[PDB]
Amino acid sequence: ATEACLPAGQRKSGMNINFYQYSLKDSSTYSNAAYMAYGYASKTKLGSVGGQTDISIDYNIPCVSSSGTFPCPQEDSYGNWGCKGMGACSNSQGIAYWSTDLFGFYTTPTNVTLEMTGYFLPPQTGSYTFKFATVDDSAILSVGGATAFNCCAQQQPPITSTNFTIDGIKPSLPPNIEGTVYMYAGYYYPMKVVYSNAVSWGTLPISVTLPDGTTVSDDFEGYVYSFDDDLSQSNCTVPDPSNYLEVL
C-alpha cells in the first residue's frame, strides 16, 4: 500500500513551489536519480511560492522580431531560427531568459529546478494514473509518505527515495510517461514533482486519470493541498489506509 496521512492542522489550497539553481546548458546533472530525488536542494535556493493549483509547465522562450518580442511556441520554431508568423528571431536560443511564467516567480525558466509539494486528496477509492505528456527537460513524480515526503513534514528537507511514481529523468524518453497509484478516498497522499530545465523551452503537462475514467489536466484545484509542518502530530501517518482503524 501507498502510505497516506491525516494532517489535523489548517488545510491550504494548492502546492508549494521551491526553486533551486540549475546551470544553463548543463545536460548531465539532471540525468541522475539522486539529484532529482533530493540533490537539487543542495544547490542554492532561489525562492518559493505557495498555493499553486495549476501545475503544468509550458514555457516558451522569446522571439525578438521588429514587430516586438513574443513567446514562441516550441512547435512554431524553425530554421536558424524564426517563429511561424513572426519571421526571423534576433535573439539566441541558447542564453538564459527571465520570466514569471513559472508560478509567477521571477526567475530563469530556461535553467532552473523546481520542487512542487503538497498532498493529493482522492475523492474516490481506486486506481489513479498520473501522466506527463512530454518532459522538457527532466522530471519525476513521487506519491506516498515513504516516497514523496513524510506525513505532516511537507516543509522538511527532501527525503532520499528514488522509488518514483513517474520516472521522467532525461536519459530522450517517450511521450506519455505514466505511473499508477491505488488510493483510498479521503486520505491525504504526499505528492512531489521535481522538474528541471537546462535550456530554452520547458514543458511538463501533468494530468491524472481518476478511477471513474475521467481525466484532470493542469488545474488540480480541489485535489491538491498544503499543510504547515507539524512534527508533533503522533497519529498523522497512515501506512496502510485500507487497514486504518478509526473513522474518517
Q: Using the rule CB under 5 A, is 136 a contact of Na ion?
A: yes
Site for Na ion in 189-248 (CB under 5 A): 197, 200-201
Helix/strand/coil for 19? strand
State the nearest-atom distance from the C-beta of 69 to Na ion, in Å.
19
Q: Using the rule CB under 5 A, is 115 a contact of Na ion?
A: no
Stretch that binds Na ion, among 118-126, 131-139, 157-165, 209-217 (CB under 5 A): 131-139
Give dist(CA 162, CA 38) in Å, integer: 9
Closer Cβ to Na ion, 26 or 229, answer by number? 26
In a 10 Å sphere around its CB, with 0-12 CB exposed, 13-18 middle and 19+ buried, how is residue 66 labelled? exposed
Side-chain half-sphere exposure of 3, counting CA atoms within 13 A: 16
Chain breaks in the chain (C to N over 2.5 A) after: 171
Closer Cβ to Na ion, 116 or 159, answer by number? 116
DSSP 36: H
State the nearest-atom distance from the C-beta of 201 to Na ion, in Å.
5
Closer Cβ to Na ion, 3 or 137, answer by number? 137
Nearest C-alpha neighbor of 16 from the set 87, 116, 99: 116
210: amino acid identity, one letter? L
Stretch that binds Na ion, among 3-11, 129-137, 154-162, 166-174 (CB under 5 A): 129-137
Q: Using the rule CB under 5 A, is 138 a contact of Na ion?
A: no
Residue nearest to Na ion (CB): 136
State the nearest-atom distance from the C-beta of 61 to Na ion, in Å.
9
Site for Na ion in 68-107 (CB under 5 A): none
Stretch that binds Na ion, among 7-15, 132-140, 158-166, 171-179 (CB under 5 A): 132-140
116 has which bridge partners? 17, 193
Number of residues that bind Na ion (CB under 5 A): 5
In the numeric block, which cell numbers belong to residue 231? Answer: 512534527
Q: Radius of gyration over alpha carbons of the chain, in Å?
A: 19
Give dist(CA 96, CA 160) in Å, integer: 30
Near Na ion by CB under 5 A: residue from 131, 137, 143, 195: 137
77 has which bridge partners? 83
Sites of contact with Na ion (CB under 5 A): 136-137, 197, 200-201
